[PDB]
TrEMBL record, chain A:
Lineage: Bacteria, Pseudomonadati, Campylobacterota, Epsilonproteobacteria, Campylobacterales
Name the UniProt record assigns to this protein: Carboxyl-terminal protease
Residues of the full protein shown: 372 to 447 of 454
Family: Belongs to the peptidase S41A family.
Naturally occurring in which organism (per UniProt): Helicobacter pylori (strain G27)
């Protein structure tokens, strides 16, 4: 889910001034499960850093 | 004389007046102009305001109980306190309270708004809210009924050992309440602090709460500009729960203490902040008597997190960011098993976990911590 | 002495504030607060603002900035923008890497008026072609339609639209009225036209009113407080008038309306006016500084002040989403029925003009 009132870009075709080479948030937001996996990895990273 | 310019200007006003008022008023409107033109939160206190703000104190005149702050110049409410009549109404964080009592509140000192909210509990008061979501500057009234509620309470979770613990305002004994509640459930191996929508509190309780979960401790730094007056807080050695997995929640309706404790843990890697950015109320103000029968209210120190950053504008950026919404639910019933197959109320329920996603991801982030802990035996 | 309060406060703001500001920026932050808190319109002009104000047609394209995009509503015929044919949606992408589309302030404020001779090649882009373009647009001083006479379709009434009270509105009105002089009716249009030179408003009022007092500027000073009184050379003392006011009319446009109304010499048709009844003259205070302050108020012949109170039109009426145009009626060189029907305010102005003609006849 997201909350927004006006387009982040001024217009869909204005103000915006190899895709498989790396995942991007536009595809992550399409699949909640990959987002949850990344969140779990981030929790694991934080926990591992707590052992320093 | 560097001081000349002001007197030179005021002298011109004296002779080219359009009103009819003495130099006393030109000075009064000069000082009150300076404070409001220096920082948002400051204000002036004349003899009457200083007199009526110096000593008066009573629970009844608390009023709506909501908290207010300045966004960028347009006044906005930060978060309604849970359970108050405003909370039961449509009041929501991030909106601009344009007027109170049908009185234009634009460019008016915040302490005046705070005083206006005060009054007899049984008195209706109207407010002209402005919600960016809608195009209509909605209006609504509500009675000033003051409710006192210790927001601290420990609720268990049905099918997991993890403990739900909401802290929606730091009262005088928040630390004691949370400590007792957590001690009442030794079996638990998780805490999900729901600091979400907690406008703020007194520092001498947020510091204690943070000390509860940290051993070495460099919690906050109230520095200011006078190096001799800088203050640094450090959590004492004792830490009753220095190993429990934690997962804090923060939204735009939490600031001041609610990001002092959340921010402190994030910098000690002692928890994972979940939700979305906070408001960023990162300044303190004191009431300094200036001259005879008068005083001013001016920011004196900004709060500094352990890493040296400031909460004044940046706020807290949670590690896991997810906006509120209902959890997706199963919709299909696949043919997992077929013919010729082989054989052989007073607690947080899965419903209240399902309706909101921010609490579903905070419990999930506790499960990963448990898994990682079990990997180390 | 009396400066004890401010001197005592400035010490605390110097020792306790958290950013360690100096005694100069605080003072610039103090008087600035005084004027802003003195009267709404008052402002402080430092040396930079002094030179800016000391030292003029705009580009003319109506930068509506609707939905952020600089959507042009209507170009001004006097500027080469109309000649080029600037269409709605044309955007000024950027002057110098400032991203003016996010907030268009500097360009309009200090590049279109100031130094109009700037080379006009400012990233000429169109709605249909975001890429930079060349359209040979030129820019210079632009004449404005401060007077615009369109006559009317078939009646002896002269539609007179004044968009700005500049020093030449009176002579232009004289010439326009002298054109088609046989007409026996006039409709002033002050909808918009925020103001102009007071002397010009007095001249336009004198063009009709005969002998009474037009405007008073008493202010506070017992001296000054100069009155303006009409002169016997008022050419047209009986020609019907019907002025149209709006929220966008104030200052000069509301002292002409207020003066005619108080003499019962016209019909005020429209809605409540803004109420810009204040004169603010810049006053140097230092070698390189000045301050703008309210100096005098405008009182009408009846004596009522032009405050935010404004003027209450005789015949209250609104522009009208749906004029009386499609209610089951059946069983370019002038003002034709089309634009007359487009808005109901002009229709009511013409209607009230007609009743005046009939009353003229019953008594002649």
């Amino acid at each position: 889910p997201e909350n927004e009132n006006k387009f982040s870009l001024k217009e869909a075709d204005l103000k915006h001034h190899e895709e498989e080479k790396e995942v991007t948030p536009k595809m992550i937001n399409d699949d909640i499960q990959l987002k949850t996996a990344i969140d779990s990895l981030k929790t694991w990273s934080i926990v591992d850093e707590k052992m320093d | 004389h560097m001081f000349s310019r002001f007197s030179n200007v005021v002298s011109e006003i004296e002779k080219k007046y359009v009103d009819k008022i003495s130099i006393s008023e030109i000075m009064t409107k000069a000082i009150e102009g300076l404070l409001s033109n220096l920082d948002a939160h400051s204000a002036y206190l004349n003899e009457k305001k200083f007199k009526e703000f110096q000593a008066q104190t009573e629970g009844e005149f608390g009023g709506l109980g909501i908290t207010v702050g300045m966004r960028d110049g347009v006044l906005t409410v930060i978060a309604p306190l849970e359970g108050t009549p405003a909370y039961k109404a449509g009041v929501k964080s991030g909106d601009n309270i344009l007027k109170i009592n049908n009185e234009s509140t634009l460019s008016m000192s915040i302490d005046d708004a705070i005083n206006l909210m005060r009054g007899k509990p049984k008195t209706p008061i109207q407010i002209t809210i402005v919600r960016k979501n809608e195009p209509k500057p909605l209006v609504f009234n509500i009675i000033r009924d003051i409710i006192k509620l210790p927001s601290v309470y420990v609720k268990k979770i049905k099918e997991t050992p993890y403990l739900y613990v909401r802290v929606s305002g730091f009262d005088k004994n928040v630390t004691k309440s949370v400590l007792e509640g957590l001690k009442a459930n030794p079996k638990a191996k998780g805490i999900v602090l729901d600091l979400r929508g907690n406008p703020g509190g007194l520092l001498n309780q947020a510091v204690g709460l943070s000390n509860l979960f940290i051993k070495e401790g460099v919690l906050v730094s109230q520095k200011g500009k006078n190096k001799e007056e800088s203050l640094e807080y450090k959590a004492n050695g004792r830490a009753p729960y220095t190993n429990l997995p934690i997962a804090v929640l923060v939204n735009g309706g939490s600031a001041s203490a609610s990001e002092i404790v959340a921010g402190a843990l994030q910098d000690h890697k002692r928890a994972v902040i979940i939700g979305e950015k906070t408001f960023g109320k990162g300044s303190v103000q004191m009431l300094l008597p200036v001259n005879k029968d008068e005083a001013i209210k001016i920011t004196t120190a900004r709060y500094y997190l352990p890493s040296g950053r400031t909460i004044q504008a940046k706020g807290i950026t949670p590690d896991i960011v997810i906006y509120p919404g209902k959890v997706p639910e199963n919709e299909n019933k696949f043919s997992l098993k077929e013919a010729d197959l082989k054989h052989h109320e007073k607690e947080v329920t899965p419903k209240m976990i399902n309706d909101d996603i921010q609490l579903k991801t905070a419990i999930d982030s506790l499960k990963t911590w448990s898994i990682v802990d079990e990997k180390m035996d």
